[PDB]
């Protein structure tokens, strides 16, 4: 239930934070999908986090490790 | 499709990787589909073990797959499957030094069966580029003659291969390849 922050100023729209998030990958890549909500979607060229109320993230670091030009900061402390 | 992993289905019976369906099953299924829908043209068929000696046996094995179908359509056709470039499928023998023609056997089977129509792939004895949708044959040819080779795998669908080749007159292999198509055409009763 952590909080992710995306630096819009250096986001290129690469979409490798959307493809690599394992909560996004739940809908289409799971047998009998449990939850179909998504943290990121690239609207107007930058990654927007729809997870406003910080309910779905799991601090996995797959998205921080994925962005090619580090731009996603993961906060492990309560918002 | 096994070429997409790097293998080839060298006979009519071996299964596809991860699919465990066989050339025989897929040919039969497509024939049933075609004659059920009543499409104008039949199942045009390439075949297996292309371009190797001794594959007239496999050519007969793949031609025996139509023995239980009848061409039903509102268009006039008596085929149920069309076996193409058969001078390529009518080789005989073990290798390229004990290599002769099986056109006699192939056309005996075709002269028997009336639901099988063919065409010849007569080689015109010149320089040419060979393009078939199957990878393994082109790769094998490249490893034989050490000339260019292009491969275009499609996604969830087919393969490809382009390789120049010299069908020159100064080779026993090319001479016999030329003779085979003429034997096929001149052994045709119909």
């Amino acid at each position: 239930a952590f909080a992710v922050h995306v630096n819009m100023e250096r986001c290129t729209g690469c979409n490798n934070c959307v493809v690599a998030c394992p909560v996004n990958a739940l809908e289409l890549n799971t047998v009998n999908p449990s939850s179909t909500d998504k943290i990121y979607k690239v609207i107007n060229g930058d990654a927007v986090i729809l997870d406003v109320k910080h309910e779905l993230c799991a601090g996995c670091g797959i998205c921080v490790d994925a962005c090619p030009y580090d731009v996603i900061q993961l906060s492990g402390q309560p918002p | 499709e096994a070429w997409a992993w790097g293998e080839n289905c060298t006979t009519i019976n071996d299964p596809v990787p991860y699919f465990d369906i066989t050339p025989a099953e897929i040919v039969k299924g497509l024939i049933e589909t075609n004659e059920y829908l009543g499409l104008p043209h039949s199942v045009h068929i390439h075949g297996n073990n292309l371009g190797n000696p001794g594959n007239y046996k496999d050519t007969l094995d793949t031609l025996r797959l139509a023995e239980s179908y009848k061409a039903k359509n509102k268009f006039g056709r008596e085929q149920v499957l069309h076996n193409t470039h058969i001078q390529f499928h009518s080789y005989k023998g073990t290798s390229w030094a004990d290599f002769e023609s099986g056109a006699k056997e192939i056309m005996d089977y075709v002269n028997a069966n009336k639901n099988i129509t063919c065409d010849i792939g007569q080689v015109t004895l010149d320089e040419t580029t060979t393009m078939t949708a199957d990878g393994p044959f082109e790769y094998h040819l490249n490893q034989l003659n050490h000339i260019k080779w292009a491969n275009v795998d499609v996604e969830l669908e087919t393969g490809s291969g382009v390789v120049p080749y010299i069908y020159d007159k100064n080779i026993k292999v090319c001479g016999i390849q030329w003779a085979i198509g003429l034997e096929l055409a001149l052994y045709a009763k119909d």
Partner: protein
């Protein structure tokens, strides 16, 4: 002359976690470790969304693995 055994091998006890890896793999069955916890853990593989090897990365006792993909001509429809 008989036996050599130069030195000694023993387990730091405030760091070991009862994994049973060294006991299971010791050549002479000379290690005596008993797991602190008992129970069962199950993995419903059909619900993992693929590229999330967080469980593999964080398992202390490296019990978890990504089952190696089989080669072609060996997949056998599974």
């Amino acid at each position: 002359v008989g036996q050599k055994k130069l030195g000694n091998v023993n387990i730091i006890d405030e760091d070991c976690c009862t994994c049973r890896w060294c006991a299971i793999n010791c050549p002479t069955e000379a290690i005596t470790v008993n797991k602190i916890f008992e129970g069962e853990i199950t993995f419903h593989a059909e619900k993992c969304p693929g590229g999330c090897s967080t469980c593999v990365d964080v398992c202390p006792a490296n019990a978890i693995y990504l089952p190696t993909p089989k080669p072609a001509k060996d997949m056998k429809g599974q």
